Design a binder for this molecule. Structure first.
Ligand code: ADP
Ligand code: ARG
Ligand code: MG
Length: 356
């Protein structure tokens, strides 16, 4: 590791120390001992600790604050990643292994709010990384383009309900782009946490969205992860939303090779997305429980649920609409993760109905 990087790491560490209002997992778990023992380490593709922690040093309002520039990073900087992963996913020890993929009995899932008084829309997504490619900070412009061609060619063979069109961001009109974002379909541009992780280079080259005509099945290409695979619709019919996702993923997995680790499950750029990579969410109004956003969050956390704003993480609630989803993704099966969202949302609705 070059001396300029060391200097920057030292001031970075000093900055986290003196930030008493910082509550990130990075601040919590990067101790002097941990720091000294990995700060001189470098991965096979030359990623350093600075590449891992820069986002969380620059954005002190980070909740987690680290990313993995390449797959090797998860082991090379294991003394930092391991306790943060344990913490975030609710108990995952050095001796633990993520279980094999298991979608489970789809017929056991239920509709979430048949009267339709609380849930606006239901969404399940997964992420995948292509074998043979590093994560965002180590990609070249040529590689973004290569992966885009591979992925869009594969998706053009989708059939029936999953049949659709790939739309590159390159050449998309500002009007279409902004409309897709406002309608909750397309990822937003210019996320500061991603940008400071060097994860947005060469933007918009290689970035785009595939969707069917109904926009109930969507694929994001080269945003945070190589692929995000999304199923969504209005209402709370979780069984239909999940079924569609399962069908799409199993179909795509038979055509593309995805990185899967014996311990961590499916590999992703952020440690919060490891394992099942699954985030099942509702957009929901809870007039009585959400009177205080802080009380909503305390209830939700007892159900291992996370609260986000209307336009995604790091945004505010607009019109009392929250995004509520399973927090944990690693150390439990796909079926378990979606059940944690299902069960928790059912109970929160019961509490809202009973509340005075
Ligand atoms: N249940 C939902 N219904 C409609 N839109 C949703 C739902 N959950 C998330 N979204 C939208 O997904 C987009 C991405 O949000 P973000 O928090 O980055 O989630 P992720 O990247 O995990 O999919 C945002 O436009 C957000 O409003
Ligand atoms: N898109 C995600 N991976 N979100 C979870 C981490 C987001 C951001 N890096 C933080 O520490 O707050
Ligand atoms: Mg996102």
């Amino acid at each position: 590791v070059d001396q300029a990087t060391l200097d920057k790491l030292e001031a970075g560490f000093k900055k986290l120390q003196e930030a008493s209002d910082c509550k990130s997992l990075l601040k919590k778990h990067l101790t002097k001992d941990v720091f000294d023992s990995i700060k001189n380490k470098k991965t096979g593709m030359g990623a350093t600790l600075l590449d891992v922690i820069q986002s969380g040093v620059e954005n002190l309002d980070s909740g987690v604050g680290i990313y993995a520039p390449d797959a090797e990073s998860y082991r090379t900087f294991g003394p930092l990643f391991d306790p943060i992963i344990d913490d975030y996913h609710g108990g995952f020890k050095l001796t633990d292994k993520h279980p094999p993929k298991q979608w489970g009995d789809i017929n056991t899932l239920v509709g979430l709010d048949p009267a339709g008084q609380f849930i606006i829309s239901t969404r399940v997504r997964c992420g995948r990384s292509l074998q043979g490619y590093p994560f965002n900070p180590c990609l070249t412009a040529e590689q973004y383009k290569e992966m885009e061609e591979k992925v869009s060619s594969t998706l053009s063979s989708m059939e029936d309900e999953l049949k659709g069109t790939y739309y590159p961001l390159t050449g998309m009109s500002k009007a279409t782009q902004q409309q897709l974002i406002d309608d909750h379909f397309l990822f937003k541009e210019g996320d500061r946490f991603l940008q400071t992780a060097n994860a947005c280079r060469y933007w918009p080259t290689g970035r785009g969205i595939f969707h069917n005509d109904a926009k109930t099945f969507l694929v994001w290409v080269n945003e945070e992860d190589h692929l995000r695979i999304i199923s969504m619709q209005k209402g709370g019919d979780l069984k239909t939303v999940y079924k569609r996702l399962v069908t799409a993923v199993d179909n795509i997995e038979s055509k593309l090779p995805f990185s899967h680790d014996d311990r961590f499950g499916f590999l992703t750029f952020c440690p919060t997305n490891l394992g099942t990579t699954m985030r099942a969410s509702v957009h929901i109004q809870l007039p009585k429980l959400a009177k205080d956003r802080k009380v909503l969050e305390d209830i939700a956390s007892k159900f291992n649920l996370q609260v986000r704003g209307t336009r995604g993480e790091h945004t505010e609630s607009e019109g009392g609409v929250y995004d509520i989803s399973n927090k944990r993704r690693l150390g439990l099966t796909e079926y378990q993760a979606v059940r944690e969202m299902q069960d928790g949302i059912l109970e929160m609705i019961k509490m809202e109905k009973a509340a005075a």
